[PDB]
Amino acid sequence: LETFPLDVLVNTAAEDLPRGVDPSRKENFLSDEDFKAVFGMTRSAFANLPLWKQQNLKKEKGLF
């Protein structure tokens, strides 16, 4: 997957999102560094959270 800066994924209108980005899984397109900074847990740990909780965490962080 191509990576995009946190600020880009947070502050881009849906219609302006790069075509390769799944708007429901923006976190997958963060660099490993940015993912760690934002969520503070491993990708695997995050993916093991119930989907509703993943989404709720993402909402505040601007990544929903």
Swiss-Prot record:
Post-translational modification: Phosphorylated on tyrosine residues. The unphosphorylated form increases the initial rate of actin-nucleating activity, whereas the tyrosine-phosphorylated form inhibits actin-nucleating activity, enhances actin-bundling activity and enhances actin-severing activity by reducing high Ca(2+) requirements. The tyrosine-phosphorylated form does not regulate actin-capping activity.
Ranges that cross the membrane: none
Impact noted for substituting W52A: Loss of F-actin binding
Top-level taxon of the source organism: Eukaryota
Domain HP: 1-64
Region (Headpiece) residue spans: 1-64
Protein purpose: Epithelial cell-specific Ca(2+)-regulated actin-modifying protein that modulates the reorganization of microvillar actin filaments. Plays a role in the actin nucleation, actin filament bundle assembly, actin filament capping and severing. Binds phosphatidylinositol 4,5-bisphosphate (PIP2) and lysophosphatidic acid (LPA); binds LPA with higher affinity than PIP2. Binding to LPA increases its phosphorylation by SRC and inhibits all actin-modifying activities. Binding to PIP2 inhibits actin-capping and -severing activities but enhances actin-bundling activity.
Assembly, per entry: Monomer. Homodimer. Associates with F-actin; the association with F-actin is inhibited by tropomyosin.
Family stated for the protein in its record: Belongs to the villin/gelsolin family.
Name this protein carries in UniProt: Villin-1
Source lineage: Eukaryota, Metazoa, Chordata, Craniata, Vertebrata
Residues of the full protein shown: 763 to 826 of 826
